[PDB]
Amino acid sequence: TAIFSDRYKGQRVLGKGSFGEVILCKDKITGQECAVKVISKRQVKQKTDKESLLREVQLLKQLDHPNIMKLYEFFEDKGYFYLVGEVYTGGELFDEIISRKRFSEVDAARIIRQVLSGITYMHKNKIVHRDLKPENLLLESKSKDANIRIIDFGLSTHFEASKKMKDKIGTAYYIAPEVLHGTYDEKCDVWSTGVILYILLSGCPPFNGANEYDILKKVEKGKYTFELPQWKKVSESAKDLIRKMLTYVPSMRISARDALDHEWIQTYTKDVPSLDNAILNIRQFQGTQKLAQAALLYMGSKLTSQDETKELTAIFHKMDKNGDGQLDRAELIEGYKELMRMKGQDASMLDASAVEHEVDQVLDAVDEYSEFVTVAMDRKTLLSRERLERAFRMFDSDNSGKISSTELATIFGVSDVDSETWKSVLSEVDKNNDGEVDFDEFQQMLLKLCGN
Numbered sequence: 001t002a003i004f005s006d007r008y009k010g011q012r013v014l015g016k017g018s019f020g021e022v023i024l025c026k027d028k029i030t031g032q033e034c035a036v037k038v039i040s041k042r043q044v045k046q047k048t049d050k051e052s053l054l055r056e057v058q059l060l061k062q063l064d065h066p067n068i069m070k071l072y073e074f075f076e077d078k079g080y081f082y083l084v085g086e087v088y089t090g091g092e093l094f095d096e097i098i099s100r101k102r103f104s105e106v107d108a109a110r111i112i113r114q115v116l117s118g119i120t121y122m123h124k125n126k127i128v129h130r131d132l133k134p135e136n137l138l139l140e141s142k143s144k145d146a147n148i149r150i151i152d153f154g155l156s157t158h159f160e161a162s163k164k165m166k167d168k169i170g171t172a173y174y175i176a177p178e179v180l181h182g183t184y185d186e187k188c189d190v191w192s193t194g195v196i197l198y199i200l201l202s203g204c205p206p207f208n209g210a211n212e213y214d215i216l217k218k219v220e221k222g223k224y225t226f227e228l229p230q231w232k233k234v235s236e237s238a239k240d241l242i243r244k245m246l247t248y249v250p251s252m253r254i255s256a257r258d259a260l261d262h263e264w265i266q267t268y269t270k271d272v273p274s275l276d277n278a279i280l281n282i283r284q285f286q287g288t289q290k291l292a293q294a295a296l297l298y299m300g301s302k303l304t305s306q307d308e309t310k311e312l313t314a315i316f317h318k319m320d321k322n323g324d325g326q327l328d329r330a331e332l333i334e335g336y337k338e339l340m341r342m343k344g345q346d347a348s349m350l351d352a353s354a355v356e357h358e359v360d361q362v363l364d365a366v367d368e369y370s371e372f373v374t375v376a377m378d379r380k381t382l383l384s385r386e387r388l389e390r391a392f393r394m395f396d397s398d399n400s401g402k403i404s405s406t407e408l409a410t411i412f413g414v415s416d417v418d419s420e421t422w423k424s425v426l427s428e429v430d431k432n433n434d435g436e437v438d439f440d441e442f443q444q445m446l447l448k449l450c451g452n
């Protein structure tokens, strides 16, 4: 049997994705770079037996399509699954779209064609995505012509969707009604692609609401309109395809394959204005979604840190069998290894070598075990804290330094934080009734919302 750390070494942590953290890794012999999704058997419940998962893995390894992430290898140990595939460097589709001069029906059609083509291919092979959303769409490279790669095909079939809002963020917009009710098939992916197309052409989700449950209610009802002004500058054939994709009864819904043949895909991927309003709305949409996301991740990292800080102090105290408050390099390493032995393996610490290295990074800064803990945990939180500052600066497009109480409502609503609870927290911070918070205030609000 093969061990993952015998073959690969961690380079960078790429981020949190569905069901797990993704690491840029490198083959120890060949120097081949790869992206690895690490799935914690603790945090995620399986829906199928081991035999069925292995069988799916084997098939996925043989499949090949230019719009589908390529899987190379699969590993399993006591506590983890490791899905090893091709690295893509162009980031998420929507992030590229917001940094564009012009965007038209031609651009959207070229995008949708790719998605549909990838989906069609996978449906032929009896694989359903079920969780398709903008963040599942990566661009292959930084190039302007670069292909879209759909990630995560085949995961939702074998793993139960997280119930934590940190993981649920932004899922409600895209889910087909029949997924909510339990009887679903491959048509659910056409629905989600229809929702994505709708957003691409208007910058607004077709089913919206002030919170998660409110969005699900609208989805379940199935009603939506092209009433928004920006739809006036959009072709009738686009709206027609949307209607067919967002058809309530799945048996009456257009297939992925027939969507490829639709008048709209044919004409605009074969004299077209730029949807300026849509670019402006998508930029707002994306900023909103990413700040809400950063906020929840920041709170989680804060809690995780508090938990680990105390545990690490309790390890270094027990190890300090002479009681002086200071320790040697080797002790710190064995202690830090104990922390991951108990609290579970960390993203950037795939093996014993990774921990040794991390300790030395902390020690190179410290120039007293309490001071080691401080810097160590600070380094653990760094990426969530700066993701917060950056998403805050991104959202604050006017560089005003502030976010209004209206904007907060939208942010907390997407974060699914109780309206009465954050208003309460806002009152304690905004004692001046400015109706707005700066970054530090915003950050204090979040600390108060996670028990601090």
Ligand SMILES: C=CC(=O)N1CCC[C@@H](n2nc(-c3ccc(Oc4ccccc4)cc3)c3c(N)ncnc32)C1
Residues within 6 Å of the ligand: 014, 015, 016, 017, 022, 035, 036, 037, 060, 069, 070, 071, 083, 084, 085, 086, 087, 088, 089, 091, 092, 138, 151, 152, 153, 154, 155
């Ligand atoms: C701005 C945030 C951004 O871009 N993100 C957010 C942070 C993670 C990034 N990410 N993820 C993958 C990837 C890697 C492995 C994988 O496992 C399989 C699951 C099922 C079947 C086969 C493989 C799924 C996705 C990934 C990747 N491959 N390449 C580059 N980034 C990746 C994208």
